[PDB]
Amino acid sequence: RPTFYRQELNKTIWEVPERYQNLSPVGSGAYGSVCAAFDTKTGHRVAVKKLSRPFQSIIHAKRTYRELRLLKHMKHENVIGLLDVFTPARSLEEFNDVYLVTHLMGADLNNIVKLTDDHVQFLIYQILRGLKYIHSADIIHRDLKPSNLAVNEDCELKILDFGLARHTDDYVATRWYRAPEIMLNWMHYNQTVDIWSVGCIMAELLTGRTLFPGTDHIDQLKLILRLVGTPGAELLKKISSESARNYIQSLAQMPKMNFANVFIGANPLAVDLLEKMLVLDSDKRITAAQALAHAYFAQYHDPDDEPVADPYDQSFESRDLLIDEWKSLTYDEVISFVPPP
Numbered sequence: 021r022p023t024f025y026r027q028e029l030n031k032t033i034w035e036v037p038e039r040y041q042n043l044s045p046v047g048s049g050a051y052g053s054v055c056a057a058f059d060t061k062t063g064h065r066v067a068v069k070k071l072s073r074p075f076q077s078i079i080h081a082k083r084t085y086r087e088l089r090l091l092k093h094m095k096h097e098n099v100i101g102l103l104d105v106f107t108p109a110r111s112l113e114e115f116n117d118v119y120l121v122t123h124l125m126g127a128d129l130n131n132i133v134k135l136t137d138d139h140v141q142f143l144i145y146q147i148l149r150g151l152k153y154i155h156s157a158d159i160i161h162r163d164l165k166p167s168n169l170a171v172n173e174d175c176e177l178k179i180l181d182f183g184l185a186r187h188t189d190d191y192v193a194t195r196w197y198r199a200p201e202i203m204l205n206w207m208h209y210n211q212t213v214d215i216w217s218v219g220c221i222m223a224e225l226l227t228g229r230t231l232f233p234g235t236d237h238i239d240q241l242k243l244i245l246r247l248v249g250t251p252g253a254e255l256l257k258k259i260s261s262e263s264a265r266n267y268i269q270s271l272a273q274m275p276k277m278n279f280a281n282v283f284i285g286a287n288p289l290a291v292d293l294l295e296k297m298l299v300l301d302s303d304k305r306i307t308a309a310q311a312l313a314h315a316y317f318a319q320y321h322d323p324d325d326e327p328v329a330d331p332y333d334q335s336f337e338s339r340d341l342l343i344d345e346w347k348s349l350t351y352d353e354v355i356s357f358v359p360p361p
């Protein structure tokens with residue numbers, strides 16, 4: 021079994037197999053911290069995440085289990101998956117730390133502000149291809165924003181589950197990229213909430229500006245409505261919340277702007293696609309599979325290399341278990357891990 025070493029990196033002790041060398045902080049978040057490392061087995065560079073306090077509560081414990089489950093499942097070129105998972109623990113009884121290893125990508129899409137239409141085509145194509153895969157397993161991301169999209173200098177893109185709150189060397193609000201139907205509650209929505217976010221991102225790649233930079237959830241709705249217009253009866257009748265129905269309607273007249281105007285200069289096929297992604301009504305927004313068949317992506321679309329995922333068991337999400345139950349289940353997933361070839 022591997023020999024582990026210890027190293028202190030900004031007040032966190034890291035304990036990793038000797039295989040991973042040259043640990044270099046990349047950043048941190050509320051759910052963990054991440055280093056770059058060199059993997060001597062493959063001669064490639066990887067990212068290593070040390071989960072922060074994985075079993076400190078039933079909510080940490082459930083999150084820890086979710087992340088491991090989800091990441092073991094993801095096997096697609098445009099979705100971050102697991103190269104490795106490890107713990108210094110030699111038994112369940114000493115199990116209190118979880119480390120996850122993936123490809124190092126070296127930047128997030130937000131940093132790509134530090135693009136031709138072909139560039140936008142390729143980036144958005146890859147997001148949609150990863151989303152086809154995720155969505156096919158009945159997984160919804162629910163917080164897609166540029167800081168959750170890992171990108172190489174190659175322009176290859178992988179969807180991350182969680183990005184960095186702080187980078188080392190060295191801001192992106194969820195609500196800017198969130199669909200209107202989930203802006204106040206979670207009562208009526210499906211996988212297309214992710215498609216809205218894609219539209220927001222695609223808009224920002226085309227224009228260099230945040231599309232809907234709301235100062236809060238009410239102002240977010242106001243910026244959104246200014247562009248897509250006030251909804252008519254067919255959408256207002258599907259809204260249950262009296263509060264939501266009232267803000268959506270209580271506006272100094274909001275005309276559906278001409279995406280033609282808003283995005284003048286763009287490939288008209290981009291504008292068309294944007295118009296189908298940024299549809300207010302969740303039930304009529306284009307899906308990832310439909311968006312991939314859009315003529316905007318004719319340079320890249322190949323239906324024979326846009327795979328779907330194996331069946332994913334999300335039943336645990338309904339469960340309310342004890343910390344030690346989640347911990348044992350997590351440990352099971354750790355022990356059973358089989359690395360990719």
Ligand SMILES: CCn1c(Nc2ccccc2Cl)nc2cnc(Nc3c(F)cccc3F)nc21
Pocket residue numbers: 046054067068069091100101120121122123124125126127128169170171180181182183184187
């Ligand atoms: C959120 C950090 N992060 C993870 N997290 C993760 C997720 C699931 C399982 C294991 C990990 Cl480490 N994997 C990454 C791969 N590549 C890079 N690149 C990179 C960078 F080097 C600098 C700034 C931004 C970046 F995206 N970041 C990663």
